[PDB]
Design a protein around this ligand. Structure first.
Ligand SMILES: O=C(C1CCCCC1)N1CC(=O)N2CCc3ccccc3[C@@H]2C1
Lengths: 218, 218
């Protein structure tokens, strides 16, 4: 039957998996927990059969899985998108972790009261990270060529996210901008983003110092 | 010719890759940068041919690679250790990210002046993370059975590391303790740990609030 994807009803860790499932035109159900609903989760937490209980979880009946990167790589794996030979698979994994750099970087410093003096710091590093993708896309449509791999949706979510921190960070990175529009112009992604299903906010969990609330940026 | 592994001469991100190379009895050379030696790196940084310049890097001549997880998964991949089918590969990736939870968790909070009020926090979560591995090993020799996979050396390094934060954190987790002794009793790991090659400290980069210096714990 339909896979279950469970996470908080935020963007957070699972957003790229959602966009990949949407792109692959795959059926899945979600358990979203809303913010009053910790208790819900803590209960079910250990009755679900996960060996490493966590959120997000992905249950299949081939598979019960709890790490966001194990989940997105599995879905991709199931569709042959993962690699191809050690070299190609390493390519994709290096792209993966090159965008976690950016995205986990937001997250390190969201939740600090010190966010604001932290922010200024992390924005000095951003453009050097960005330039690396911009250079990558200087001759490709997608991160790995003419074909969407899972890290393209990781990068879309990173870009989506760092644009709330500093709406000007992609002036200067015109390929990166077009890449963004390009993902939004895939018709499954277009549909989904118009969907009742699309969770537009928060970026992180509701309590965080940036991306939280049910809000506005910074 | 021999692969090059470049990192700071600390344990840090690359320690599990080193132990895997050692276990697989593979030849590699390292470029270690010492602490006076930022400038060294920044120079070479962009003359090395890495598409995403970073440390650690791994150069092969099939491959120039810069994300620690892309590097260790490649070396493992090259030796067939990675997976086997989408399900098995997801198993290994979930174990991977279940131990980054612990290890990146140290790292989040090393480098803060607030480490000490941060420490107390993170130690409340540790035992719940630990219990998950302890339960996992309750019937296996290694994380995935009777055979070492790359996440076993990830877990060894995590354990090695959280033992400096709280030398008592594994009283209570006797399987975890034996797993540690068990990795140290593999003869390639035994040799290496006795080696001139073994970098015993620092755990993180020299400037960090825990695991830094050329030191003692906490
Ligand atoms: O614990 C982790 C793991 C959890 C398991 C799956 C892998 C990551 N973290 C979570 C986290 O918040 N950060 C802070 C930001 C950051 C930046 C660079 C490198 C690492 C990190 C870590 C990664």
């Amino acid at each position: 039957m339909s896979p279950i994807l469970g996470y908080w009803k935020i963007k957070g860790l699972v957003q790229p998996t959602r966009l990949l499932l949407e792109y692959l035109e795959e059926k899945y159900e979600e358990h979203l927990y809303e913010r009053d609903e910790g208790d819900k989760w803590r209960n079910k937490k250990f009755e679900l059969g996960l060996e490493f209980p966590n959120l997000p979880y992905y249950i299949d009946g081939d598979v019960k899985l709890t790490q966001s990167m194990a989940i997105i790589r599995y879905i991709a794996d199931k569709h042959n998108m993962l690699g191809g030979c050690p070299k190609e698979r390493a390519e994709i994994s290096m792209l993966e972790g090159a965008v976690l750099d950016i995205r986990y970087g937001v997250s390190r410093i969201a939740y600090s009261k010190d966010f604001e003096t932290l922010k200024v710091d992390f924005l000095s590093k951003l453009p050097e990270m960005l330039k690396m993708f911009e250079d990558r896309l200087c001759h490709k449509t997608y991160l790995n060529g003419d074909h969407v791999t899972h890290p393209d949706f990781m990068l879309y979510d990173a870009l989506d996210v760092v644009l709330y921190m500093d709406p000007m960070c992609l002036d200067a990175f015109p390929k990166l901008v077009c890449f963004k529009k390009r993902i939004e112009a895939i018709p499954q992604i277009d549909k989904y983003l118009k969907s009742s299903k699309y969770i537009a906010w928060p970026l992180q969990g509701w309590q965080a110092t940036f991306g939280g609330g049910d809000h506005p940026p910074k």
